[PDB]
Design an enzyme around this catalytic site. Structure first.
Site, PDB file in Angstrom:
ATOM      1  N   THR A  85       0.777  -1.211   0.000  1.00  0.00           N
ATOM      2  CA  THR A  85       0.000   0.000   0.000  1.00  0.00           C
ATOM      3  C   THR A  85       0.861   1.343   0.000  1.00  0.00           C
ATOM      4  OG1 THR A  85      -1.639  -1.302   1.300  1.00  0.00           O
ATOM      5  CG2 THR A  85      -1.677   1.026   1.339  1.00  0.00           C
ATOM      6  N   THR A  86       1.855   1.321   0.921  1.00  0.00           N
ATOM      7  CA  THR A  86       2.713   2.477   1.146  1.00  0.00           C
ATOM      8  C   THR A  86       3.598   2.678  -0.076  1.00  0.00           C
ATOM      9  OG1 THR A  86       2.606   2.052   3.466  1.00  0.00           O
ATOM     10  CG2 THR A  86       4.413   3.498   2.710  1.00  0.00           C
ATOM     11  N   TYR A 121     -13.383  -3.358  -2.761  1.00  0.00           N
ATOM     12  CA  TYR A 121     -14.446  -2.817  -3.587  1.00  0.00           C
ATOM     13  C   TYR A 121     -15.566  -3.835  -3.776  1.00  0.00           C
ATOM     14  CZ  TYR A 121     -16.936  -0.375  -7.084  1.00  0.00           C
ATOM     15  OH  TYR A 121     -17.946   0.438  -7.710  1.00  0.00           O
ATOM     16  N   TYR A 133      -3.608 -10.121   4.354  1.00  0.00           N
ATOM     17  CA  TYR A 133      -3.649  -8.696   4.743  1.00  0.00           C
ATOM     18  C   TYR A 133      -5.049  -8.215   4.882  1.00  0.00           C
ATOM     19  CZ  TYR A 133      -2.447  -3.694   4.062  1.00  0.00           C
ATOM     20  OH  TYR A 133      -2.305  -2.333   3.978  1.00  0.00           O
ATOM     21  N   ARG A 158      -9.868   0.276   4.182  1.00  0.00           N
ATOM     22  CA  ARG A 158      -9.568   0.477   2.839  1.00  0.00           C
ATOM     23  C   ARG A 158     -10.340  -0.398   1.818  1.00  0.00           C
ATOM     24  NH1 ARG A 158      -5.003   3.501   2.097  1.00  0.00           N
ATOM     25  NH2 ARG A 158      -3.447   3.616   3.787  1.00  0.00           N
ATOM     26  N   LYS A 205      -1.060  -9.904   8.275  1.00  0.00           N
ATOM     27  CA  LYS A 205      -0.909  -8.486   8.594  1.00  0.00           C
ATOM     28  C   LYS A 205      -2.281  -7.971   8.926  1.00  0.00           C
ATOM     29  CE  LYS A 205       0.338  -3.970   6.555  1.00  0.00           C
ATOM     30  NZ  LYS A 205       0.650  -3.210   5.274  1.00  0.00           N
ATOM     31  N   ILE A 218       4.378  -4.744  10.141  1.00  0.00           N
ATOM     32  CA  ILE A 218       4.666  -4.248   8.849  1.00  0.00           C
ATOM     33  C   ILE A 218       4.333  -2.755   8.871  1.00  0.00           C
ATOM     34  CG2 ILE A 218       4.085  -4.264   6.367  1.00  0.00           C
ATOM     35  CD1 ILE A 218       3.676  -7.370   6.741  1.00  0.00           C
TER      36      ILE A 218
END
Ligand SMILES: [K+]
Ligand SMILES: [K+]
Ligand SMILES: [K+]
Ligand SMILES: [K+]
Ligand SMILES: [K+]
Ligand SMILES: [K+]
Ligand SMILES: [K+]
Ligand SMILES: [K+]
Lengths: 292, 292, 292, 292
Positions: free
Chosen positions: C44-45, C107, C133, C138, C161, C203
Site C-alpha cells: 500500500t505504502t 471494492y 492482509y 480500505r 498483517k 509491517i
C-alpha cells in the site's frame, strides 16, 4: 481492594421486584468462598437504573451487613447531574464501603471539560476513593485518556473501569497517570487482553456465576502467566459473550437462578424476562464453562 | 398542538441555577408572538437531566401558567425506569398539558420488547397523548420502526419525535402506522428534509432563537412549498449545526442571552459555560440568520 | 524473515512519477544498516494502487537487485479478482522474494467463503509463503478470525498483517492457528500493544524514517521487555499518528525527502502533494522522534 | 438518458465465466420492452472488479451493438489510479456510449483535493458526460457535497450516483450545483425517498429483475405521484433488501437465472455461488414482488 476479579453483583429480587435478602446472602457467601476481590453493589448489573436512591442505599447497606467485613464493598454512585452524584455519595460516607464506582453522565453528553468538573466536584466532597466508569455504548459520551490524566491528579480519584472494549486505551491512560492508578476492565470478553496490556483487574459480570475461575484467571494474569490464564478465559468466552445475548442483567440473573444461587430471575421494567432462545444460548455457555 | 414548529424550550436560569420566571415569561410571550405551534417543557434542551422531579414539575406548571392558554404545552416525562416514568407522568394528569414527550430508557439499553412494555405501561396509566422520543446517540437504545408500529396501536400513543437524523425512518414508520400518527423531526439540520418526506413538523432547538423563521418554514412545508421553505432553511443551517458546537443547550442558552430573550445563560453541571471559540461560532451563525 | 520490524517501503519517484533507482538504493542501504527485518515492496505504502503490473514487477526486481541478498524482500501481490492475484503471483515465482503480502479483495466485498476460496486458490498455485492482509477501512471487507483459522491450515499461508487496529483480533486468531503462524500488526499506532498481546512483529510505515528505533522496539517486545519498548514507542507515537494526517504515503514520502533519504516526494494521482499544514505537523513529529 | 430507472446490468456469463451473448441480448431486449431509461454496462453489478480492461471494453461494445440504438448505454469507467481511469475512458471516446459512470478511487483513500484532481483530469481527457459515483462502503472514500460542488463546475461533469444511503446528501448537493446536474440514487432501498427529496432517478440493481415496476415507480415519482409510487416500492422492498443478502451480484444473477432471463448464474471469484439459504430468501422476495 481495587485489583483482581471484582464482581458487578446482581441485585436479586423476589417476584414483586423487591430485594431478596436470602438470595443476596447466598451470593455474598459464594464470593467470599470463591476468592472474589470485592463486590460492586448496585452498579449497572445491579440494576442501578431501576432502584430509587433509597432502595439503592438499602441494598448497599444490606450488602455491607451480609459481607460482615469478609469482602470489600464498592458502591455504584454515578448520576448524570453533578449535584445528584454528590448527594448520593454523601449517603455512603462512613457506611463502611471502601470506594465508589461513578459513571460518566449519561444522556446529556457533556464535554470533556464538563466531565472533568463533574468528577472533580464529586471527589472534592468525599474522602472515599472514586473509580471512574467509562461506557460510551450506554451513556453517549466517552471519557478520553487526556481527561482521565487530568482527573487522576485529584487525590481520591484512584482508578477507572474502562468498558469501551477498545484495548488501545490501556496504555494511553497508563502513560498519563501514576503507577498507583488502577486500570480495571469493564468488558469481560476483552478483560484478559486488558490485563495483559497492563490492567490490574476486572469489574466483571461473568464473575457472578464463575467466581473461582475469574479469581484464578486474574491472579495468573497479575503474575504474568498469560498462557495459563488464557486457558481459563477460553472456557469462559462463551459466557463472556452470551451474558449479553439479551440486555444485561437479564442473562446473568437467569444463570444465577439456574445454578441455584438466587431464588428468582425477576427484574424490573424496562428489563423483561429472558426469551427461550436466550435460555438455550446461556445454558450452553454455562455447560462450556463447566458450571452445569 | 402536534404539527408545525414546536420549540424544545430552554429552562432559563438565574446565576444560582434555578428557574428564572421573568425569562421564562419573556420566552413564552416570544413564542406566542412568533407563531410557534407548541412548547415542549423540560425536554432535553430544557435540562431534564439536571432538574429533580419536583423542580421539573414546577417548571412545567409555571410554563402552563404563563402560557395562559395561548400556546399548548407538552411535558417531557421520560425515565429509564418504567415505574419512575409512570410516576412522573401521573404528576401531570389533569395539569393542563396537552401531551407528554417520553424518551426511550437511557443507559440500561432495553430490548425492543422492553421498549414495548415500557411505553405500553406508561400509556396505560394516563389519558394523556404520548409522543415517543428516539435519540440513540444520547440513550444507547434505538426504537425501531417495527416497534413504533406495535406501539402506535395503543390508543393514546400518537406520534414520535425521531431524532436519529436517518431520514429513511420517515416512510418506514409511516407505512406501519395510521394516517393520524404524527411524525416529528428531532434533528433541526434534517427537519425540512424530514417534512419533505412526509413528516408533520419538528421539535426544534433552533426555534428557541429563530421562532418566526421556523414557524414560516414549517407552514411553507405543510403547504408543499419546499423551494421557498429551503431558502429559510439555508439561512438557518449554520444555527441548526452550530447550536451543537458544544453540548446542547450550552450554545442555545448563550444565543438566547445574546438576543436579550433570557437574563443569564447559566446551566447546571455537568453542562459548563460556552467557550470563547463557541461564542464566536454561534454569533456568526446568528449573523447569518439575520438575527443579530 | 517474517518477524520483527518489517518496512512497508515507499516507492520513491522522480518529478515525472517514475521509480528513482538512486533513492531506492539509499533506502535499502538504510534498512540494511538499521536492522530492519525485511522489506515489503509495492504494498500500500509503495503505491501498489497506481503502478501497473509491469512497473510493479520492475520495482520488486530492482529492490531485489539492490538488496543483493542482504535483506529479505516480500512482494505485495494482492488483487480484487482471484485470477489477477494468481497471475501477478506467478510473475514472482523464482524471483528471489521470500513471500507475498496479499490483501483481501477491495471494492467487491466478498463473503467469508469467497475470501477463503480466493486465498486458497492463490496459495495453491505457488510455493511462496503468503501473508494475508486485512484492512477493512480500505477494502470494505473484514477477514474474520474464523476464516483466518481455516486459511492457516493451507500449508503456505503462513501469517497475517492485521490492520484493523482492533487488538482483540490477536488472541482470537492465535487461538485458532498453530504456534508457527505469524501475527503482524498493520497499524503502527497500536503495534506495540499488538506485540504485547502475542503478535510477532509489524509491517510498518513509521519504519521508513525510524528504522533503528522500530527494529529495537520490536526486539525488546519479542524479549518481553515491554516497558523498555514503550519508551521508544512514546517517542514515535506522534509519527505513528501524523504519518496519516493526509493519505499514506503522502506524509511519509515528504518525511523521507526532509531527511534526505529520497530525492523527491512526488506521488501519482489521486495522491496529491502534502499541504503546508501537513508539513508542519509531520516535521513536529519527526523532531519528537529525534530524527531532525 | 440520465433520469428515471437506469439498470446496473449484470454481465451474464457462461459456465466458464465469460460473457454470454445470448443472455446479454435477452436482458437488453427485456429492458427495451420494459421502459428502462438507460443501461449502465460493467458497473459494480456488472462485475467491473473481475473483468480485465479488454474484457470490460468487449462487454460495453457488445452491449452497444445489441442495444442497436434503442436504449442509451453508459459505461463504467472508474479506476483507483487517475492514469488508468483516463485510459479506460479513452477506449470509449467515439464508441456510441452516452456517458461514463466513474467511481471514487477505492483502497487508496485519497483526500477531497485528490478526488477533485482525479475527476477533473478524467473529465479533461474526454468529451463524454461524466457521472460521479460515491459508494464509501465499497471504496473507503466519501466524496463530500462540497467537493461535488467544485466538480459540478467542470463542463462535462453532469451528475452523481449517490450510494451512501444517506438521504441528507440529496439537498446538500442540490444547493451547491446547478439545476441541470443530475442526482441519481445508488441505493435501491432508499431510492424512492431519494427521488421524493429532489433526486432524478436511480441506478438500480432491482431493475435487473423488476424492470417494468422500477420504470413505472420512477415515472410516478417524477410526476409527483408518491403515494402510488410507494405502493410499487412496498412490493419491491424485499428485493431491494434481499438482493444484498449475499454480496452483489450473487443474488441478482441467481434471480435473473430463475426468471429465465440468463442462461447461467456463474460469476467470477471472489464472488461465489449463492447459498441454499440465500436462494430461499431471494425466491421469497421474487414471490412478494409478484414476479414468480
Ligand atoms: K432511574
Ligand atoms: K489520584
Ligand atoms: K438526573
Ligand atoms: K394510537
Ligand atoms: K490500480
Ligand atoms: K499454514
Ligand atoms: K480488478
Ligand atoms: K457541469
Amino acid at each position: 481492594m481495587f485489583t483482581g476479579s471484582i464482581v458487578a453483583i446482581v441485585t436479586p429480587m423476589d417476584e414483586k421486584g423487591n430485594v431478596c435478602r436470602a438470595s443476596l446472602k447466598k451470593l455474598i457467601d459464594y464470593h467470599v468462598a470463591s476468592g472474589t476481590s470485592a463486590i460492586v453493589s448496585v452498579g449497572t448489573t445491579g440494576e442501578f437504573a431501576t432502584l430509587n436512591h433509597d432502595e439503592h442505599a438499602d441494598v448497599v447497606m444490606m450488602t455491607l451487613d451480609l459481607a460482615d467485613g469478609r469482602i470489600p464493598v464498592i458502591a455504584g454512585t454515578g448520576a448524570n447531574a453533578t449535584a445528584e452524584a454528590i448527594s448520593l455519595t454523601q449517603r455512603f460516607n462512613d457506611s463502611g464501603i471502601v470506594g465508589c464506582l461513578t459513571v460518566t453522565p449519561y444522556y446529556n453528553r457533556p464535554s470533556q471539560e464538563g466531565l472533568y468538573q463533574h468528577f472533580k466536584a464529586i471527589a472534592e466532597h468525599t474522602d472515599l476513593p472514586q473509580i471512574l466508569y467509562n461506557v460510551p455504548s450506554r451513556t453517549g459520551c466517552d471519557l478520553l485518556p487526556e481527561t482521565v490524566g487530568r482527573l487522576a491528579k485529584v487525590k481520591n480519584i484512584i482508578g477507572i473501569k474502562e468498558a469501551t472494549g477498545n484495548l488501545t486505551r490501556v496504555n494511553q491512560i497508563k502513560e498519563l497517570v501514576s503507577d498507583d492508578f488502577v486500570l480495571l476492565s469493564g468488558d469481560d470478553a476483552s478483560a484478559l487482553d486488558f490485563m495483559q496490556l497492563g490492567g490490574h483487574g476486572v469489574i466483571s459480570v461473568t464473575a457472578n456465576v464463575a467466581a473461582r475461575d475469574m479469581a484464578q484467571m486474574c491472579k495468573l494474569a497479575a503474575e504474568g502467566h498469560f498462557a495459563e490464564a488464557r486457558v481459563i478465559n477460553q472456557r469462559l468466552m462463551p459466557l463472556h459473550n452470551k451474558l449479553f445475548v439479551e440486555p444485561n442483567p437479564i442473562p446473568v440473573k437467569w444463570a444465577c437462578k439456574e445454578l441455584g444461587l438466587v431464588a428468582t430471575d425477576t427484574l424490573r421494567l424496562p428489563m423483561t424476562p429472558i426469551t427461550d432462545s436466550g435460555r438455550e444460548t446461556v445454558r450452553a455457555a454455562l455447560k462450556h464453562a463447566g458450571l452445569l
